[PDB]
Amino acid sequence: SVYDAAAQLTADVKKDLRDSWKVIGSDKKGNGVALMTTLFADNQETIGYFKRLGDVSQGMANDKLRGHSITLMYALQNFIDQLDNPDDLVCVVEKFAVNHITRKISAAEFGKINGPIKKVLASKNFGDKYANAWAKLVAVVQAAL
Amino acid sequence: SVYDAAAQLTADVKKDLRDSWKVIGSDKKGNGVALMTTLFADNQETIGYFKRLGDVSQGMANDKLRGHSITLMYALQNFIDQLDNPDDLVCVVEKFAVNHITRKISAAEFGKINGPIKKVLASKNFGDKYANAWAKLVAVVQAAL
Ligand code: HEM
Ligand code: HEM
């Protein structure tokens, strides 16, 4: 269950999630857009899912993409703040899961976000240990998909 | 015009928004649910729109409502953080506006949130002064509906 995946997050993992988010989460617009653009560059097959955002090749200049990217970072902000209370993390995760379930996004496709996250983390010098930590949080969402 | 509405957020308005948010935003789950139940309590005709959340009269015991309430508080957190930049405030406002436009929520019905906001603010000892400041921010979203 989602609760099982959440309840597994250990103190060391939560520590790595928090320390890396302190940095990346401090520039939500910059790092959020970078995440989305990286996803489109490495997984061109997903572009079709974001037709509402218009021309995503426009990057920062695209207001719809910018608004979406900033908002996405707050979803992660939400997750990070709920880490110490699995019950709350679970209810917020299931809420966002519905958003993607309605767009027919499978657990497998959602995991495509791990590659981009790893690259963004790297640009700030956060290594594999940190990428692995974020992979675990993403798995919580996957458990709901 | 969402842009003209955003221009209404003068230095004094932004200050009152930040000051009051420091207190209310500190307990997103509590004040978030308080906001929603007050809305359902004072405006029973809006309850129909929240069909997916199930039985809202259960309040805090309703996971879906709790997950929704917390997320809503993060939307407000988003707005507050974008106050310095009207271009970014506008693109995030329009993003959330789309979420409600699709739900057939008009500018007038969205305005019904002003009542609950004034009440939640009052219970924390923040008067009309702060309630009006928040009506200004809500007005920005209304301009995009
Ligand atoms: C860390 C990972 C991710 C987070 C936290 C996240 C967060 C979000 C948020 C907050 C929204 C807005 C939901 C709404 O208001 O309707 C959204 C929309 C969406 N997401 Fe994700 N997402 C992530 C990964 C992905 C991935 C990997 C895909 C695709 C394989 C995906 C596909 C979509 C689609 C299609 C939309 C709708 C866009 C639109 O039409 O506005 N998401 N996401
Ligand atoms: C302070 C003002 C408000 C804010 C910041 C706000 C924020 C939000 C957020 C973040 C969502 C989730 C978006 C999604 O995942 O699709 C949402 C959904 C929704 N909102 Fe609002 N909202 C506000 C006021 C209202 C009011 C006054 C109404 C009704 C008259 C309304 C009706 C809805 C409905 C029907 C949904 C869909 C709930 C669901 O099925 O999950 N909102 N709102």
Swiss-Prot record, chains A, B:
It is found in: Cytoplasm. One of its GO terms (cellular component) is cytoplasm. Heme b binds at H100. GO terms for molecular function: heme binding; identical protein binding; metal ion binding; oxygen binding; oxygen carrier activity. InterPro entries: Globin, Globin-like_OT, Globin-like_sf, Globin/Proto, Mb-like_M. PROSITE patterns: GLOBIN. Keywords: Cytoplasm, Heme, Iron, Metal-binding, Oxygen transport, Transport. Residues 8-145 form the Globin domain. Homodimer. Belongs to the globin family. This is Globin-1. It comes from Anadara inaequivalvis.
